[PDB]
Amino acid sequence: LKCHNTQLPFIYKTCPEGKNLCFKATLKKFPLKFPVKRGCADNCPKNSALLKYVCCSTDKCN
């Protein structure tokens, strides 16, 4: 399963071992904001003190 992390350009990669899923997160930076990170996934993250995470199943699903 191949997905996304950089996205700036959609130019992607395949996941690694232990990474059947896909997540992404974002920051409570700006009233509006500019997300955080992404990649593949496994469990389903521990959103933060100041963030959010979400995690899909399918390709580039995050």
From Swiss-Prot:
The cellular location(s) given in this protein's UniProt record come to:
Secreted; Target cell membrane
A cellular component term from Gene Ontology for this protein is: extracellular region
Q: Which UniProt keywords apply?
A: Disulfide bond, Membrane, Secreted, Signal, Target cell membrane, Target membrane, Toxin
Name the source organism.
Naja atra
What protein family does this chain belong to? Belongs to the three-finger toxin family. Short-chain subfamily. Orphan group XV sub-subfamily.
Q: Disulfide bonds, which pairs?
A: 3-22, 15-40, 44-55, 56-61
Q: What is this protein called?
A: Cytotoxin A5
Q: Which GO terms describe its molecular function?
A: toxin activity
Q: Which residues of the full protein are shown?
A: 22 to 83 of 83
Protein's job: Non-cytotoxic protein that does not show lytic and hemolytic activities, but can induce aggregation and fusion of sphingomyelin vesicles. It binds to integrin alpha-V/beta-3 (ITGAV/ITGB3) with high affinity, and it inhibits osteoclast differentiation and bone resorption in mice, probably due to binding to integrin alpha-V/beta-3.
Ribonucleoprotein as a keyword of this entry, yes or no, is: no
Would the keyword Disulfide bond turn up in this protein's UniProt record? yes
